[PDB]
Amino acid sequence: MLKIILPSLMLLPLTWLSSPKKTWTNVTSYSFLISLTSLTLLWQTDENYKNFSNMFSSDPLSTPLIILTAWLLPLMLMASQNHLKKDNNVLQKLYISMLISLQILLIMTFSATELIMFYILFEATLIPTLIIITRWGNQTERLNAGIYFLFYTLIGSIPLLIALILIQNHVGTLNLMILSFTTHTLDASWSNNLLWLACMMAFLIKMPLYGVHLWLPKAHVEAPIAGSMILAAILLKLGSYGMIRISIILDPLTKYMAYPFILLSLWGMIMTSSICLRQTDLKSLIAYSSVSHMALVIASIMIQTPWSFMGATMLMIAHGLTSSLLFCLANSNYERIHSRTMIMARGLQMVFPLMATWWLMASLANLALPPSINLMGELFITMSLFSWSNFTIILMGINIIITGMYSMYMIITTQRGKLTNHMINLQPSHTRELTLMALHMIPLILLTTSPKLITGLTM
Amino acid sequence: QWQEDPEPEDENVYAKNPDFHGYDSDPVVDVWNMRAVFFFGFSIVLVFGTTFVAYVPDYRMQEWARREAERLVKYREVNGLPIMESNYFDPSKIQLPED
Amino acid sequence: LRYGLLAAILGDKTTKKLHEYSRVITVDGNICSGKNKLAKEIAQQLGMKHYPEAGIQYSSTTTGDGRPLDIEFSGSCSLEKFYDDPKSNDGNSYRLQSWLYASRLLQYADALEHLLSTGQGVVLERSIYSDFVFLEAMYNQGYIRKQCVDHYNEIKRLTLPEYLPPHAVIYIDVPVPEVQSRIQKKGDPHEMKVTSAYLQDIENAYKKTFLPKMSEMCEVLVYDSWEAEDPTKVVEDIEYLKYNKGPWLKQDDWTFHYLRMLVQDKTEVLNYTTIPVYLPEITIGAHQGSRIYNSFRELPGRKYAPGYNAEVGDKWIWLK
Amino acid sequence: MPSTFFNLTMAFSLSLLGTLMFRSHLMSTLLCLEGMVLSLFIMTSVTSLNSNSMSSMPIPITILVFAACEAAVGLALLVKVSNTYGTDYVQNLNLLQC
Amino acid sequence: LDLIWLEKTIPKSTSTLHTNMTTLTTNQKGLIKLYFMSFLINIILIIILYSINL
Amino acid sequence: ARQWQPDIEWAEQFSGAVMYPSKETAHWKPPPWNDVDILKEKAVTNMTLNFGPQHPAAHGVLRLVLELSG
Amino acid sequence: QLLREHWVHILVPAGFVFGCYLDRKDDEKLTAFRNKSMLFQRELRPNEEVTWK
Amino acid sequence: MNPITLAIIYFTIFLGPVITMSSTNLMLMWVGLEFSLLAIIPMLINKKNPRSTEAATKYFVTQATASMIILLAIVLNYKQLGTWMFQQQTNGLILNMTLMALSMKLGLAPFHFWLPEVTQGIPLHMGLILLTWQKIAPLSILIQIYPLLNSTIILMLAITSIFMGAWGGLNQTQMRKIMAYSSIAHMGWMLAILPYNPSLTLLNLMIYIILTAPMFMALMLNNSMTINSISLLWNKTPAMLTMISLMLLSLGGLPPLTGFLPKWIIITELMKNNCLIMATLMAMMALLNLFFYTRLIYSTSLTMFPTNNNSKMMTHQTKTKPNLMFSTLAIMSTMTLPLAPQLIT
Amino acid sequence: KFYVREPVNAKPNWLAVGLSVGASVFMWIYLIQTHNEDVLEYKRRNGL
Numbered sequence A: 001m002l003k004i005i006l007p008s009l010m011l012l013p014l015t016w017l018s019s020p021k022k023t024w025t026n027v028t029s030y031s032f033l034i035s036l037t038s039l040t041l042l043w044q045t046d047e048n049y050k051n052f053s054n055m056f057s058s059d060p061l062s063t064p065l066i067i068l069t070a071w072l073l074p075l076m077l078m079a080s081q082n083h084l085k086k087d088n089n090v091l092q093k094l095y096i097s098m099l100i101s102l103q104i105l106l107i108m109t110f111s112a113t114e115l116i117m118f119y120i121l122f123e124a125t126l127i128p129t130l131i132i133i134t135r136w137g138n139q140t141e142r143l144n145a146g147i148y149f150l151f152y153t154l155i156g157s158i159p160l161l162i163a164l165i166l167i168q169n170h171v172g173t174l175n176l177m178i179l180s181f182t183t184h185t186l187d188a189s190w191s192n193n194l195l196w197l198a199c200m201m202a203f204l205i206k207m208p209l210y211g212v213h214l215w216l217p218k219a220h221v222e223a224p225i226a227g228s229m230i231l232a233a234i235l236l237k238l239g240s241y242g243m244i245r246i247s248i249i250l251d252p253l254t255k256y257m258a259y260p261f262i263l264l265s266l267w268g269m270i271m272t273s274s275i276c277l278r279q280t281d282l283k284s285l286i287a288y289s290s291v292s293h294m295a296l297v298i299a300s301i302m303i304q305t306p307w308s309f310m311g312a313t314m315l316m317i318a319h320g321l322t323s324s325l326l327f328c329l330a331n332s333n334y335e336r337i338h339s340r341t342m343i344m345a346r347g348l349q350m351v352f353p354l355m356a357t358w359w360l361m362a363s364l365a366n367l368a369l370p371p372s373i374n375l376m377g378e379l380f381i382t383m384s385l386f387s388w389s390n391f392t393i394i395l396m397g398i399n400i401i402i403t404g405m406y407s408m409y410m411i412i413t414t415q416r417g418k419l420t421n422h423m424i425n426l427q428p429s430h431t432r433e434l435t436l437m438a439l440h441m442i443p444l445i446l447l448t449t450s451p452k453l454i455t456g457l458t459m
Numbered sequence B: 001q002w003q004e005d006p007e008p009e010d011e012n013v014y015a016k017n018p019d020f021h022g023y024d025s026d027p028v029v030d031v032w033n034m035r036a037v038f039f040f041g042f043s044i045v046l047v048f049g050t051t052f053v054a055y056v057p058d059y060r061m062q063e064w065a066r067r068e069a070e071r072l073v074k075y076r077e078v079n080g081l082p083i084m085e086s087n088y089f090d091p092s093k094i095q096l097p098e099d
Numbered sequence C: 001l002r003y004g005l006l007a008a009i010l011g012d013k014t015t016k017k018l019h020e021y022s023r024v025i026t027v028d029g030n031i032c033s034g035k036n037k038l039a040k041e042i043a044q045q046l047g048m049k050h051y052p053e054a055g056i057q058y059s060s061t062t063t064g065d066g067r068p069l070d071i072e073f074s075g076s077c078s079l080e081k082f083y084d085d086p087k088s089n090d091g092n093s094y095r096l097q098s099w100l101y102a103s104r105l106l107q108y109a110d111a112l113e114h115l116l117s118t119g120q121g122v123v124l125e126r127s128i129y130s131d132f133v134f135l136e137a138m139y140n141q142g143y144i145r146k147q148c149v150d151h152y153n154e155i156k157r158l159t160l161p162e163y164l165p166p167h168a169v170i171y172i173d174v175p176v177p178e179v180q181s182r183i184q185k186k187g188d189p190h191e192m193k194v195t196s197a198y199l200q201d202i203e204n205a206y207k208k209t210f211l212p213k214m215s216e217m218c219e220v221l222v223y224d225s226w227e228a229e230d231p232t233k234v235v236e237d238i239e240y241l242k243y244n245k246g247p248w249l250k251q252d253d254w255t256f257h258y259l260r261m262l263v264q265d266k267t268e269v270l271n272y273t274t275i276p277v278y279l280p281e282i283t284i285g286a287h288q289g290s291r292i293y294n295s296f297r298e299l300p301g302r303k304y305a306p307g308y309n310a311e312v313g314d315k316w317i318w319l320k
Numbered sequence D: 001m002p003s004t005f006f007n008l009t010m011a012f013s014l015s016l017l018g019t020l021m022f023r024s025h026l027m028s029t030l031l032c033l034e035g036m037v038l039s040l041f042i043m044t045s046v047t048s049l050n051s052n053s054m055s056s057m058p059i060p061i062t063i064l065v066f067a068a069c070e071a072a073v074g075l076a077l078l079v080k081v082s083n084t085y086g087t088d089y090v091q092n093l094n095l096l097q098c
Numbered sequence E: 001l002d003l004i005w006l007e008k009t010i011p012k013s014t015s016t017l018h019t020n021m022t023t024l025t026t027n028q029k030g031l032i033k034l035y036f037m038s039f040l041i042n043i044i045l046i047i048i049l050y051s052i053n054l
Numbered sequence F: 001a002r003q004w005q006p007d008i009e010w011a012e013q014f015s016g017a018v019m020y021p022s023k024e025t026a027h028w029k030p031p032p033w034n035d036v037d038i039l040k041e042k043a044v045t046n047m048t049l050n051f052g053p054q055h056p057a058a059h060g061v062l063r064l065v066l067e068l069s070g
Numbered sequence G: 001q002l003l004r005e006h007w008v009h010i011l012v013p014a015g016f017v018f019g020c021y022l023d024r025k026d027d028e029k030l031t032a033f034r035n036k037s038m039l040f041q042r043e044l045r046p047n048e049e050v051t052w053k
Numbered sequence H: 001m002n003p004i005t006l007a008i009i010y011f012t013i014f015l016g017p018v019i020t021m022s023s024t025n026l027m028l029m030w031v032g033l034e035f036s037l038l039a040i041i042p043m044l045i046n047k048k049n050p051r052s053t054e055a056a057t058k059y060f061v062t063q064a065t066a067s068m069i070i071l072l073a074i075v076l077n078y079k080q081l082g083t084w085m086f087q088q089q090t091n092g093l094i095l096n097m098t099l100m101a102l103s104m105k106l107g108l109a110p111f112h113f114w115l116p117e118v119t120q121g122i123p124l125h126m127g128l129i130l131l132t133w134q135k136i137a138p139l140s141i142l143i144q145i146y147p148l149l150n151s152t153i154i155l156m157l158a159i160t161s162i163f164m165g166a167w168g169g170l171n172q173t174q175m176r177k178i179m180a181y182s183s184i185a186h187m188g189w190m191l192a193i194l195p196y197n198p199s200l201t202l203l204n205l206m207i208y209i210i211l212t213a214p215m216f217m218a219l220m221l222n223n224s225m226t227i228n229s230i231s232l233l234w235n236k237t238p239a240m241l242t243m244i245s246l247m248l249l250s251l252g253g254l255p256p257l258t259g260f261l262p263k264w265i266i267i268t269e270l271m272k273n274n275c276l277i278m279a280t281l282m283a284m285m286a287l288l289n290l291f292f293y294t295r296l297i298y299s300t301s302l303t304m305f306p307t308n309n310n311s312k313m314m315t316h317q318t319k320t321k322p323n324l325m326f327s328t329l330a331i332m333s334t335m336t337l338p339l340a341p342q343l344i345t
Numbered sequence I: 001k002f003y004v005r006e007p008v009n010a011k012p013n014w015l016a017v018g019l020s021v022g023a024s025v026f027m028w029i030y031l032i033q034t035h036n037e038d039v040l041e042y043k044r045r046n047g048l
């Protein structure tokens, strides 16, 4: 893991020592090489786990998240290097440093073998995205969004720290494999119920669970494009990864303690899909779609079925890719028309045909068109939920119907229809942003071609 | 009023550089950034990395598990054994509690 | 900063280096009234350092290369624009007044540092004690407003009592029609567009507030033009002046030491001129402030500390 | 000795109560401080004389020395307060709330 | 739900509670007479707590 | 298009020394920048003494009204 | 002058080589069960001294 | 102040806590406290303004009353046991009076009402000297008698200290008051970990000192006493915004800053001693502390408040004010979390 | 002469430069010597 961590660390001196006319080129190229290096974690020819060191290890669950982070860093640089052209050189290098630090800390968080180090890197990732949102956001409400994000996460994560220290005192090491082997069954008392809630509520906050999801739409709206990408594509999945890692020592009382959160997830995905149906802001629509998909992931992890875990992993990877792609397309329209209003730009299919093709493919990925990994994850989550209870199919079907409805509504109101001819400032297309859309869509196609990479721990 | 700078207007970047690629204002850095993004992103990652992942062998013991399953099926079918025993563990080595 | 408590202990005593001509003499008058020549001749024939009137570009001329910088770096205020349109809605008048007060504060700190360091006397033209006359003239002509006056008075209260007043204040009394005639003879088209009401407000502010307030703590030397326009009788009076009042008598070595440290720390001098009172005539905003600050930092010789700018010929940077 | 020591402890308690319950006079507060000091001296002195601890007999004198330095500094501060306001009123000493 | 009642329930109610508490605790008059009377109350309460704990 | 930055009202919401005004603290003022408050000049209460006329040093018939500071 | 003006291109490869070296250091640090696992307990071939390096 | 009286006053300020820490005798520890108080009063009142006079008066009467209660405890112990040290069998009333008086000297709630007011109205360097140096000697006295103290009263004092510090820091805009309520909260943490492990008390004290020193130095760069005054720091000293943000986040206890380490290890020791309720409440109020730190960061670094016209002249002038020891303390208070096993014992 | 006033850092403080370089060299040399002596003492105490 050190062979990925060290050159990502060396990206920062490269950023601060490169010429201002060469910084973007050098950092983008070497981050692409970093991702190519990170692809060596897929060499898993055995049932064992690649425990590289005493503090770093690789997993069938951790590996796709690490590869996705390393792949998202150059895409974030390409996405963010347009709204920083009228910007100071040291501020540009600081922004690149923030993105690189996010990538480093997220790779270390996913490769961590010890839960206290996982929590330390959790908060370490909490810092620079707050800095990015607050400093390079556009509207006034970025400060309130950053406060909401930071303190939802902190109030979640403090009882997680208390619970981790308690489990460390009880067991001795807080090492993941040691806990997985010497797991003890809890006796289902009120203290154990509170311990369960303490170690689950941080991840449920960052997922986000319904009712506590209020930080996410304003944070994603007010964030810059790279911040929205890293948030919606890695940090929610970081919460899910924490849930999967910590759920192994919570038997058996997760069986009955999972009940309120499954109901919250299902009804919240219905409610947030309805909000997407009636939402006037494109980034808000994408954010609430992310809330619904992560609610599906929450329900799968709560029901703790091998099909549910596999569908959760596939939906994590697929939703990260398609949500970053949707945010990049919305940011292209935002850099064109300087607005986020859903209905303001309408006939963009006429002027931007290839970008309309990218929009259509992103939305078809969003509504889980087969045989994509989006549909793979959603279908296996549905199968596991129907095994858990046959009446969940009603909520699943309503969610699927509204999902297709808001995705096609987005397509029709942003691309189809008559062209808003007053928008004289419609530059044709940037090869940079078309490349960004291609670099989002192609890994979706390749993972659709070979879905065995992102199945996860259970299969 | 407070001496605040007026709102900057985004000019048409294609007006002065019709071959603009989205990366930088001057054409040379722009075209070299485009070449670096395409070459290091598409050519050597989306092709060589895809080939490497495609030629990772026996990924999580898929084909090994298939071959071992075929061998065990042949053995248990020519020896009259059950295909799967109902108990994974032998009951002789398990000490049940008395009551 | 080389001077400090260690240098004071090793011996840098101001009272040791004082003499009979270690005086602060401020020459004051109306807009065009014999003030530049009188101060020059007084300093020349008393062996004192002459400080001309602190203009807009005083800090620019005393820092860096010493060339006059661009106007947006130096205050973003124009005396010619004030003369053309004194009641302009952008707020040029009070911006000019506050910038000139800050420039006079910097010049007074420079003169005090020079006097406490070398012992040579200083002859200033129109120091900080005679700038509220322009403020009150602007206010009584309606050019600025009461909030501007309150902000100026707050800054003056924050900055003025930290220093010592001049030993001698020389005043030139020239009547308003004579000032108008001299302005016409000078021939500046912008300066010709001044009002006798404004000039009379300056003179009234002088006679009603400046002269008695300096009379209670230093020696006042009101002269007419004919007693002036001949800088030898004034010099003879200065020679036979007896300084027997004011706060200069109670000063000792350590009070001089702390005053010298204050006037040699220039950011400490200008600390209260940048109070965060958000008056719209003087507050700027983040975008314009960043643009001006970045342009000033990319100015030659201003990117780093003095002595560290390699583009202007600084050497041995890696050894310091 | 125990009744005397209890009375001295109650005297210290009364002087501390006077110090903690202000009236208008900072000088009266300083006098309450000096009464606390006096009670401490008498307690230490009778303890040393009862236990025959001649080695610890310099301790009450040290208490008096440092307490008199405290009273001296309090008088100097009261001088500064009276120069500021004209009186020693703790109700005048109140403008640091904001 | 989202623009009204979830906001009224968790974040705005938490901020309102802490704003009320910080006003109530930083509503001091700046009088050392009141501060020392409070200190006397603290002394009495500590003595009572020790006497009941034993 | 341009990033929002705090204007005069956002910059002025942080001055007032309390940050959360109420009825019992709305009368507060921010502390001075130099921590030197402008106080009302107290009148000097000099003692007035009738030196004489019944005084050995007043020579019998002098009413020396003496205004004394100490 | 290419070494002077393109010296920044070696920082990331140097970090990669250093990371590979540190991974080798961790591999040789964790050798307490080298050819001692009950799954892979095999007799050493005469031309080798370790099972893995 | 002439150098003779500067040397005398500063040497006595230094000598007070040194005598207190080196003294075996309770009476010599007490006279070290007297030395510290008496020597620090003239430098508090050195500026000779009404606010400085009020601050010096309040500090004098508070520390004098607390020292008299300390002397009462010492004399009562000498009466009971015949010695000049709380050995093992001194009365719990005597120990509680010692704890209460030392907590009033330290300035933790509910004895905290003077500390923001004394910190206001004095210059920034004297606020630094107060909030760092003046707490070492009372903490040393508390550390010497750690197994004898009452955990219930200590935990109550600690939890109310952290609560009142969080709420006061939330309300205040004056930088000196903000730093004083920060001191109250961190003193609450130190007192909370005092009866269980005084090594962690010393660790938290050292972390707080090396975090408080450069924050006060950065305030001392421009005499920024207000949120707005520190908000226009981007025009004055733009190179200090990152270190200001990092030090404020370290004061907030955010990982991976080294200021997370004292709160983390104190929580760990409390969990080892089974005080989970106290640990969780202290952690939530520490989150509130981090909130007012984050609002300060928003004001000074992440946003850009409007500047003045004379700030152009201030940029024309040059400064040599930030000393050599600023950056060392800032780095050691920012990026030292991986050396946590070395920082703990 | 570019600046109107002579900067305090116009010429390098040679005493400070020499003292700092000598301190760095002395500390490195002393560090290496004490590390070698510590290695030798550890070997001599543990019989290696």
Ligand SMILES: CCCCCCCCCCCCCCCCCC(=O)OC[C@H](COP(=O)([O-])OCC[N+](C)(C)C)OC(=O)CCCCCCCCCCCCCCCCC
Pocket (backbone or CB within 6 Å): A155, A156, A157, A159, A160, A162, A163, A166, A191, A192, A194, A195, A197, A198, A201, A202, A205, E009, E010, E011, E014, H276, H277, H280, H281, H284
């Ligand atoms: C984001 C959501 C935030 C709020 C919900 C957080 C989780 C709620 C449920 C857990 C209780 C609170 C966290 C406790 C962390 C430690 C848990 C643990 O170790 O449990 C076992 C322990 C029990 O210890 P034990 O396991 O050693 O028990 C010993 C048992 N015997 C003797 C049989 C062996 O539980 C506790 O100690 C819990 C005490 C909690 C007291 C303080 C609660 C304060 C309020 C909490 C919420 C504050 C934030 C929100 C405020 C409002 C916002 C709108």
Ligand SMILES: CCCCCCCCCCCCCCCCCC(=O)OC[C@H](COP(=O)(O)OCCN)OC(=O)CCCCCCCCCCCCCCCCC
Pocket (backbone or CB within 6 Å): A039, A042, A063, A064, A065, A067, A068, A071, A317, A364, A365, A369, A370, A371, A372, A443, A445, A446, A447, A448, A449, A450, A452, A453, A454, B045, B046, B049, B050, B051, B053, B054
């Ligand atoms: C792992 C975590 C990842 C996280 C995100 C990473 C992003 C960065 C990615 C960088 C590059 C890494 C690529 C990873 C995927 C590699 C795909 C691949 O080559 O898979 C191997 C596969 C053959 O493998 P095989 O074992 O035969 O498959 C299982 C059968 N037992 O090979 C093949 O089958 C050949 C594939 C290439 C040939 C072209 C295929 C074109 C397919 C067109 C599909 C059209 C329809 C699409 C519909 C979409 C609807 C939305």
Ligand SMILES: CCCCCCCCCCCCCCCCCC(=O)OC[C@H](COP(=O)(O)OCCN)OC(=O)CCCCCCCCCCCCCCCCC
Pocket (backbone or CB within 6 Å): A144, A147, A148, A151, A152, A155, A156, A210, A211, A212, E010, E011, E012, E014, E015, E016, E018, E019, F013, H284, H285, H287, H288, H291
């Ligand atoms: C279905 C699940 C149900 C169960 C889980 C419920 C909990 C979910 C997680 C909690 C989320 C809380 C979110 C808190 C942040 C939102 C509040 C906020 O942003 O307030 C802002 C406001 C200051 O606004 P300001 O910027 O000054 O003004 C606007 C323009 N100037 O701020 C203020 O006015 C004051 C802000 C105070 C600090 C708030 C954050 C810290 C809260 C500490 C909680 C302590 C808990 C223990 C309390 C003691 C014991 C009861």
Ligand SMILES: Nc1nc2c(ncn2[C@H]2C[C@H](O)[C@@H](COP(=O)(O)OP(=O)(O)OP(=O)(O)O)O2)c(=O)[nH]1
Pocket (backbone or CB within 6 Å): C029, C030, C031, C032, C033, C034, C035, C036, C037, C053, C079, C082, C097, C100, C101, C131, C134, C191
């Ligand atoms: N409004 C305003 N104008 C000022 C201020 N200080 C100087 N001026 C203007 C007045 C004149 O037009 C110009 C030059 O000032 P002087 O008094 O030195 O005039 P000048 O040199 O022409 O004549 P003189 O020195 O009297 O022989 O600067 C000020 O504070 N406010």
Ligand SMILES: [Mg+2]
Pocket (backbone or CB within 6 Å): C035, C036, C053
């Ligand atoms: Mg002139």
